Amino acid sequence: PCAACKFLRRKCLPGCVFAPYFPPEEPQKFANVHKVFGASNVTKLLNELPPHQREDAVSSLAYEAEARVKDPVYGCVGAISVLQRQVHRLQKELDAAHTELLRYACG
Amino acid sequence: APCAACKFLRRKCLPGCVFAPYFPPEEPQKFANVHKVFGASNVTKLLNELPPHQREDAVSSLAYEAEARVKDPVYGCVGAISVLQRQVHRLQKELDAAHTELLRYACG
Ligand SMILES: [Zn+2]
Ligand SMILES: [Zn+2]
Numbered sequence: 766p767c768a769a770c771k772f773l774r775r776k777c778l779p780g781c782v783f784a785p786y787f788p789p790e791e792p793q794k795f796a797n798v799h800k801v802f803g804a805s806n807v808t809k810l811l812n813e814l815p816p817h818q819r820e821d822a823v824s825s826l827a828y829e830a831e832a833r834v835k836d837p838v839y840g841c842v843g844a845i846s847v848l849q850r851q852v853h854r855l856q857k858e859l860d861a862a863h864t865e866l867l868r869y870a871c872g
Numbered sequence: 873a874p875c876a877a878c879k880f881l882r883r884k885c886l887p888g889c890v891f892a893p894y895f896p897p898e899e900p901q902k903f904a905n906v907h908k909v910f911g912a913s914n915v916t917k918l919l920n921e922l923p924p925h926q927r928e929d930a931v932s933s934l935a936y937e938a939e940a941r942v943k944d945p946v947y948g949c950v951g952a953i954s955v956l957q958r959q960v961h962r963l964q965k966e967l968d969a970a971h972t973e974l975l976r977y978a979c980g
Contacts, residue, residue, distance in 0.1 A: 802909065803913075810945070821946050828950050837921060839933045855963040866970060
């Protein structure tokens with residue numbers, strides 16, 4: 766029984782569409798995804814993808830869902846905002862450093 | 873005029889519609905993306921998990937996340953995080969090296 770069928774009460778049949786990606790030892794993975802995206806959407810979105818991309822797709826969904834559970838307002842957009850601010854700060858600092866270095870290089 | 877959610881769902885946008893303050897008619901693709909990725913029912917319930925003063929930010933985040941998954945159906949906005957993780961590390965390395973070079977100009 767995969768994590769999905771355990772959660773969903775149903776028997777986990779050969780070819781259960783979640784079993785390849787929701788093992789029972791990771792209950793949190795399916796609970797978060799179901800709460801944020803919904804089991805039906807996930808089946809729909811996985812069917813739209815090449816089979817060889819579905820493992821990475823599930824991993825991304827699980828990451829996004831977990832971030833949504835722990836930060837209901839921003840989810841992982843919060844991380845993106847934090848990282849974008851730090852890029853800006855560092856690029857500003859690098860600007861000053863590069864001009865200082867260029868002045869030294871000119872004698 | 874019905875909000876973008878009610879126009880998409882082909883239902884009457886009534887006074888008190890939970891979507892109307894956040895899905896204006898001028899931005900139909902915003903709702904279409906959020907509906908595809910999260911679903912109207914999930915957004916309805918999340919919006920009611922939140923106080924009024926956070927709903928606008930929540931929808932903004934959902935919209936960005938859904939648009940990212942339309943553009944990148946595999947990784948979504950996690951691809952952005954991966955890129956930003958690499959870039960921050962790289963810029964920090966470059967800045968540390970520049971500070972080291974500056975000190976050698978003054979001391980070495
Ligand atoms: Zn199963
Ligand atoms: Zn409406």
